[PDB]
Design a protein around this motif. Structure first.
Motif, short mmCIF file in Angstrom:
data_model
loop_
_atom_site.label_atom_id
_atom_site.label_comp_id
_atom_site.label_asym_id
_atom_site.label_seq_id
_atom_site.Cartn_x
_atom_site.Cartn_y
_atom_site.Cartn_z
N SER A 36 0.82 -1.21 0.00
CA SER A 36 0.00 0.00 0.00
C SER A 36 0.86 1.26 0.00
CB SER A 36 -0.93 0.00 1.21
OG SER A 36 -1.88 1.06 1.14
N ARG A 39 2.64 1.69 -3.44
CA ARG A 39 1.66 2.16 -4.40
C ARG A 39 1.33 3.63 -4.14
NH1 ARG A 39 -0.81 -2.92 -6.52
NH2 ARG A 39 -0.17 -4.58 -5.06
N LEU A 40 1.09 3.95 -2.87
CA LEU A 40 0.80 5.33 -2.46
C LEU A 40 1.89 6.27 -2.96
CD1 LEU A 40 -1.01 7.23 -0.78
CD2 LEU A 40 0.52 6.78 1.16
N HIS A 43 1.30 6.61 -6.75
CA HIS A 43 0.10 7.41 -6.98
C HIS A 43 0.39 8.89 -6.76
CE1 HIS A 43 -2.69 4.07 -7.42
NE2 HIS A 43 -2.20 3.49 -6.31
N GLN A 44 1.06 9.20 -5.65
CA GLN A 44 1.44 10.57 -5.32
C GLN A 44 2.28 11.21 -6.43
OE1 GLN A 44 3.38 10.84 -1.47
NE2 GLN A 44 1.68 9.78 -0.48
N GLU A 47 0.53 11.47 -9.86
CA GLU A 47 -0.51 12.48 -9.76
C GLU A 47 0.08 13.89 -9.88
OE1 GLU A 47 -3.00 13.03 -5.99
OE2 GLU A 47 -4.45 12.13 -7.35
N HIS A 53 -2.54 6.86 -13.22
CA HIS A 53 -2.13 5.79 -12.32
C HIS A 53 -3.34 5.04 -11.79
CE1 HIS A 53 -2.88 8.82 -9.07
NE2 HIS A 53 -2.57 9.64 -10.08
N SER A 55 -4.58 0.90 -10.08
CA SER A 55 -4.26 -0.44 -9.67
C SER A 55 -5.32 -1.40 -10.19
CB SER A 55 -4.17 -0.54 -8.16
OG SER A 55 -3.45 0.54 -7.61
N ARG A 62 -3.13 -7.87 -7.61
CA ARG A 62 -3.17 -6.41 -7.66
C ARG A 62 -1.82 -5.83 -8.05
NH1 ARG A 62 -7.30 -3.29 -4.70
NH2 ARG A 62 -6.98 -1.08 -5.21
N1 LIG Z 1 -3.02 10.57 -4.54
C1 LIG Z 1 -3.65 9.41 -4.79
N2 LIG Z 1 -3.48 8.38 -3.98
C2 LIG Z 1 -4.17 7.30 -4.39
C3 LIG Z 1 -4.98 7.17 -5.50
N3 LIG Z 1 -5.51 5.89 -5.58
C4 LIG Z 1 -5.02 5.27 -4.54
N4 LIG Z 1 -4.20 6.06 -3.77
C5 LIG Z 1 -3.52 5.67 -2.54
C6 LIG Z 1 -4.43 5.08 -1.48
C7 LIG Z 1 -3.59 4.01 -0.80
O1 LIG Z 1 -3.12 4.46 0.47
C8 LIG Z 1 -2.41 3.77 -1.75
C9 LIG Z 1 -2.27 2.36 -2.26
O2 LIG Z 1 -3.48 1.63 -2.09
P1 LIG Z 1 -4.21 0.96 -3.34
O3 LIG Z 1 -5.55 1.82 -3.47
O4 LIG Z 1 -4.58 -0.43 -2.98
O5 LIG Z 1 -3.38 1.21 -4.55
O6 LIG Z 1 -2.59 4.66 -2.87
C10 LIG Z 1 -5.15 8.28 -6.36
O7 LIG Z 1 -5.84 8.37 -7.38
N5 LIG Z 1 -4.44 9.39 -5.92
#
Ligand SMILES: Nc1nc2c(ncn2[C@H]2C[C@H](O)[C@@H](COP(=O)(O)O)O2)c(=O)[nH]1
Length: 70
Positions: A36, A39-40, A43-44, A47, A53, A55, A62
């Protein structure tokens, strides 16, 4: 005056993304080894950079895909 100022210095996933941006890779498929937090991180960065981005899969299936087309 344009770019990223909030630098992490040297980040694994940020390095992966910056290469990806200049590479032929239209999509960067990450391994399920990412948790997590990992991935976070992606995503950060994606973004902020302005890439797509998401999953896909489930949990044991996943993985996260970063795309240049956003
Ligand atoms: N900034 C951002 N963070 C996201 C996004 N989607 C998921 N995350 C974050 C939430 C989780 O803490 C982390 C990885 O969790 P997962 O949703 O399973 O990929 O990524 C998104 O679109 N933008």
């Amino acid at each position: 005056p344009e770019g990223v100022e909030s630098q992490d210095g040297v980040d694994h996933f940020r390095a992966m993304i910056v290469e990806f941006m200049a590479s032929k890779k239209m999509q960067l498929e990450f391994p399920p080894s990412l948790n997590s937090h990992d991935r976070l991180r992606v995503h950060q960065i994606a973004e902020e950079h302005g890439l797509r981005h998401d999953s896909s899969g489930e949990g044991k299936r996943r993985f996260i895909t970063v795309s240049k087309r956003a």
